[PDB]
Enzyme design. Structure first.
Site, PDB file in Angstrom:
ATOM      1  CG  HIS A  84      -0.520   0.302   2.533  1.00  0.00           C
ATOM      2  ND1 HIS A  84       0.005  -0.674   3.350  1.00  0.00           N
ATOM      3  CD2 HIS A  84      -0.501   1.449   3.256  1.00  0.00           C
ATOM      4  CE1 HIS A  84       0.353  -0.136   4.505  1.00  0.00           C
ATOM      5  NE2 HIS A  84       0.059   1.148   4.475  1.00  0.00           N
ATOM      6  CG  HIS A  86       0.373   4.524   4.659  1.00  0.00           C
ATOM      7  ND1 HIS A  86      -0.415   3.869   5.572  1.00  0.00           N
ATOM      8  CD2 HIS A  86      -0.352   5.584   4.224  1.00  0.00           C
ATOM      9  CE1 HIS A  86      -1.577   4.490   5.681  1.00  0.00           C
ATOM     10  NE2 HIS A  86      -1.564   5.540   4.881  1.00  0.00           N
ATOM     11  CG  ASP A  88       4.738   1.277   6.624  1.00  0.00           C
ATOM     12  OD1 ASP A  88       3.908   1.900   5.933  1.00  0.00           O
ATOM     13  OD2 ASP A  88       4.429   0.283   7.309  1.00  0.00           O
ATOM     14  CG  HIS A 149      -3.420  -0.204   7.179  1.00  0.00           C
ATOM     15  ND1 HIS A 149      -3.178   0.341   8.420  1.00  0.00           N
ATOM     16  CD2 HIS A 149      -2.485   0.317   6.350  1.00  0.00           C
ATOM     17  CE1 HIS A 149      -2.133   1.150   8.350  1.00  0.00           C
ATOM     18  NE2 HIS A 149      -1.699   1.164   7.103  1.00  0.00           N
ATOM     19  CG  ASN A 180      -1.818   6.016  11.478  1.00  0.00           C
ATOM     20  OD1 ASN A 180      -1.667   7.028  12.169  1.00  0.00           O
ATOM     21  ND2 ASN A 180      -2.286   6.063  10.232  1.00  0.00           N
TER      22      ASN A 180
HETATM   23  C1  LIG Z   1       3.652   2.152  10.247  1.00  0.00           C
HETATM   24  N1  LIG Z   1       2.788   2.541   9.133  1.00  0.00           N
HETATM   25  C2  LIG Z   1       2.900   3.717   8.331  1.00  0.00           C
HETATM   26  C3  LIG Z   1       3.954   4.836   8.453  1.00  0.00           C
HETATM   27  F1  LIG Z   1       3.830   5.733   7.507  1.00  0.00           F
HETATM   28  F2  LIG Z   1       3.892   5.458   9.616  1.00  0.00           F
HETATM   29  F3  LIG Z   1       5.186   4.365   8.366  1.00  0.00           F
HETATM   30  N2  LIG Z   1       1.913   3.693   7.410  1.00  0.00           N
HETATM   31  N3  LIG Z   1       1.193   2.583   7.566  1.00  0.00           N
HETATM   32  C4  LIG Z   1       1.672   1.861   8.580  1.00  0.00           C
HETATM   33  S1  LIG Z   1       1.087   0.356   9.200  1.00  0.00           S
HETATM   34  O1  LIG Z   1       1.761   1.576   7.361  1.00  0.00           O
HETATM   35 ZN   LIG Z   2       2.497  -0.909   8.338  1.00  0.00          ZN
HETATM   36 ZN   LIG Z   3      -0.135   2.138   6.306  1.00  0.00          ZN
END
Ligand SMILES: [C]N1C(C(F)(F)F)=NN2=[C@@]1([S])[O-]2
Ligand SMILES: [Zn+2]
Ligand SMILES: [Zn+2]
Ligand SMILES: *C1(C(F)(F)F)=NN=C([S])N1(*)[C]
Ligand SMILES: [Cl-]
Ligand SMILES: [Zn+2]
Length: 233
Positions: A84, A86, A88, A149, A180
């Site tokens: 996805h 994000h 990370d 998520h 989150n």
């Molecule tokens: C840990 N995580 C994130 C940051 F931006 F704060 F690195 N986003 N989503 C989760 S599980 O994937």
């Molecule tokens: Zn994560």
């Molecule tokens: Zn995420």
């Protein structure tokens, strides 16, 4: 249980864990607000090359990830999928690209990464736009369970090894409260989890986005946590 935790992993380092023949998780750590979080991705052997699932949560970590793969496995990472948008999961895509790894994500993920100002995988994965959609990608099946998520989150199944990688749509058992969820679809998340269960009832190893692997028990655990969060008051 020999799976590594944050204490065995100085930040900036990466451990590999062999789950099954030709299947590994990679584990890295990252700081956030003074706490350290572990983070998982996957590595799947495909003939004489490797498929990577997700970055190691940052440029430095992802470089370390590539160095550790070469040290320990010694096969080239030819393709990478981010599950996805994000940071990370796509943080480190530029490092992969510079190293000659072809990077992939669904068009939904690429768009959301762009809006967020995150790194953007090169290639767009077709055939994953509707909940319940699956496509084969080398040695894995990619599955879009629906929003959870995040609205774009994918999961990955390795049929040869019965390994299911849930990414951040699946919580580890030690996580007792919602993580989150700023970009989550809480309303749809349990429904999305149940699609995963329906599609992979034979899964033997389930890898959460963060923390310890388990079995399919992680799915209902995640649903329980998400529903409790939903009712929060
Ligand atoms: C840990 N995580 C994130 C940051 F931006 F704060 F690195 N986003 N989503 C989760 S599980 O994937
Ligand atoms: Zn994560
Ligand atoms: Zn995420
Ligand atoms: C690549 C390769 F060959 F793996 F490097 N780069 N872009 C595409 S598509 N492929 C297969
Ligand atoms: Cl490419
Ligand atoms: Zn390419």
């Amino acid at each position: 249980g020999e799976y590594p935790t944050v204490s065995e992993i100085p930040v900036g380092e990466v451990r590999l864990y062999q789950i099954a023949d030709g299947v590994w998780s990679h584990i890295a750590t990252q700081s956030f607000d003074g706490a350290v979080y572990p983070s998982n991705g996957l590595i799947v052997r495909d003939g004489d090359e490797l498929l990577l699932i997700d970055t190691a949560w940052g440029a430095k970590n992802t470089a370390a990830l590539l160095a550790e793969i070469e040290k320990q496995i010694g096969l080239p990472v030819t393709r990478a999928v981010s599950t996805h948008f994000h940071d990370d999961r796509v943080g480190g895509v530029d490092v992969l690209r510079a190293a000659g790894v072809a990077t992939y994500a669904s068009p939904s993920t690429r768009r959301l990464a762009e809006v967020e100002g995150n790194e953007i995988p090169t290639h767009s994965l077709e055939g994953l736009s509707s909940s319940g959609d699956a496509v084969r990608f080398g040695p894995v099946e990619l599955f879009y369970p629906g929003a959870a998520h995040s609205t774009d989150n994918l999961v990955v199944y390795v049929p040869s090894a019965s390994v299911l990688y849930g990414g951040c749509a699946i919580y580890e058992l030690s996580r007792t409260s919602a993580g989150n969820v700023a970009d989550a679809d809480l309303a749809e998340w349990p429904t999305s989890i149940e699609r995963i269960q329906q599609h992979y009832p034979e899964a033997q190893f389930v890898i959460p986005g963060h923390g310890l692997p388990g079995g399919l028990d992680l799915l209902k655990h995640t649903t329980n946590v998400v529903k409790a969060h939903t009712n929060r008051s």
